[PDB]
Design a binder for this molecule. Structure first.
Ligand SMILES: O=P([O-])(O)O
Ligand SMILES: O=P([O-])(O)O
Ligand SMILES: [Cl-]
Length: 276
């Protein structure tokens, strides 16, 4: 029943929102470029539309990344598909080189799965649990994974524990899920009480920044401790090749980067036989 999300013996390199430092976030321009640069998959976010479709999108509103305004939840997919989601992407010249160009439209999560069937998906359920969108997004996420037979290549997580809990109740463990902040806290407590003999029953992925408020989270013993706890350590915001190799060597299993160019460099360094 447990999905074989992790295959081979190499950590997965994910492009942050498709590689948002180099191309307009969440667009085909970004996903195509990151895939060409050799990433193993895409980290991304989903928001629910007025007509209850999951789009690949970060903010609650379209203002920051498009020429439109207002909540995703107040727009139909049809209305959202008319927008230019590269409208505000600026290069270091200050130009907006992709505004008005092809392949700049908002993607649905369904067409992300169909269009990139070889990519692993690391997806964040963004709508809040107390919102209407949050109450139905986990089911629609599962329905989307199921109709595309993508159970073994999608990792579903959320900032909100209740969204993970809602999704996992529907998926019944058939899709890999992220470890919530509260779940890891409970794990540290059970560890201290029971001694080193404790370990989480089901392996879940705990994605961390490499640092928080001056605290370095990349210690070799911490990563080993989490692996000992049956917690899958992962990191985001990894934007140097030395840090990528360091986390690979220490036992991290997922790595989200804003610079998908590093993926190609990382993979030429590892043997081909470690990949599946
Ligand atoms: O997709 P993120 O930026 O919320 O991690
Ligand atoms: O605002 P986020 O990207 O930290 O969720
Ligand atoms: Cl609009």
């Amino acid at each position: 029943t447990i999905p074989a999300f992790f295959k081979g013996n190499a950590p997965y390199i994910f492009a942050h929102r498709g590689g948002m430092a180099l191309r307009p976030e969440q667009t085909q321009l970004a996903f195509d470029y990151a895939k060409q640069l050799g990433v193993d998959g895409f980290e991304t976010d989903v928001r629910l539309t007025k007509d209850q479709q999951l789009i690949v999108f970060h903010d609650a509103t379209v203002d920051r990344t498009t020429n439109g305004s207002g909540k995703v939840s107040a727009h139909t997919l049809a209305e959202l598909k008319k927008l230019d989601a590269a409208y505000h992407f600026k290069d270091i010249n200050g130009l907006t080189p992709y505004r008005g160009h092809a392949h700049t439209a908002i993607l649905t999560f369904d067409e992300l799965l169909k269009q990139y069937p070889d990519m692993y998906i690391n997806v964040d359920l963004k709508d809040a649990p107390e919102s209407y969108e949050g109450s139905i997004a986990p089911q629609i996420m599962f329905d989307t994974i199921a109709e595309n037979q993508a159970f073994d290549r999608v990792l579903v997580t959320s900032f909100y524990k209740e969204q993970i809990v809602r999704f996992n109740k529907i998926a019944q463990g058939s899709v890999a899920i992220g470890a919530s902040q509260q779940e890891v806290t409970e794990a540290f407590l059970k560890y201290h009480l029971l001694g080193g003999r404790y370990y989480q029953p089901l392996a879940q992925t705990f994605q961390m920044p490499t640092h928080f408020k001056g605290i370095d989270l990349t210690s070799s013993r911490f990563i080993k401790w989490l692996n000992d706890m049956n917690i899958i350590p992962g990191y985001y915001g990894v934007n140097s090749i030395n840090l990528m190799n360091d986390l690979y060597q220490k036992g991290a299993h997922t790595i989200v980067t804003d610079r998908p160019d590093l993926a190609q460099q990382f993979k030429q360094t590892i043997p081909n036989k470690l990949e599946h």
